[PDB]
């Protein structure tokens, strides 16, 4: 499931991590899977201190279909959904200070969700404790490059 992808929306119980400036407000660029997807390489940008910080990271599949990646702390995410033009993740981020920020991340080829996909995502968030308000839609706020 390789290619050039875009972050459509992000969510977090601690919204600050995905707000403009937070380390988890991640605008994706590439999601390259290996042969059996036991490792996924992610090229992505994060606006931090007014800088578009590029990162290229590997997420390895544990023996339980979960994925561990080091990025702004220890992260453990599952692929909650996977369609032809979209896919969602539910990550548990443990930053340097031990704060556990759990949340969702929709990544796809388009820049926005349909009305049906939107309500479904809102339900999934409130269901997993995250409020409807703690959902940032990164559409139109991607002022980073591909260098």
Residue numbers in the entry: 4 to 150
Sentences from the paper on this structure:
The crystal belongs to the P212121 space group with five molecules in the asymmetric unit. Cav p 1.0101 adopts a classic lipocalin fold: an eight stranded β-barrel (residues 9-112) with a short helix insertion between β1 and β2, followed by a 14 residue long α-helix and a short β-strand forming antiparallel interactions with β1. An electron density that is observed in the central cavity of monomer E, likely indicates the presence of a 1-decanol molecule. This density is adjacent to the carbonyl oxygen of Ser14, one of the very few polar atoms on the surface of the cavity available for hydrogen bonding, which is likely involved in an H-bond with the hydroxyl group of 1-decanol. The Cav p 1.0101 cavity does not display any access to the solvent. The β-barrel side open to the solvent in the LCN1 structure is occupied by the sidechain of Phe74, which belongs to the short β5β6 loop in Cav p 1.0101.
They all feature highly conserved β-barrel structures that enable them to transport small volatile hydrophobic compounds. Guinea pig allergen Cav p 1 isoallergens are found in hair and are expressed in the harderian gland.
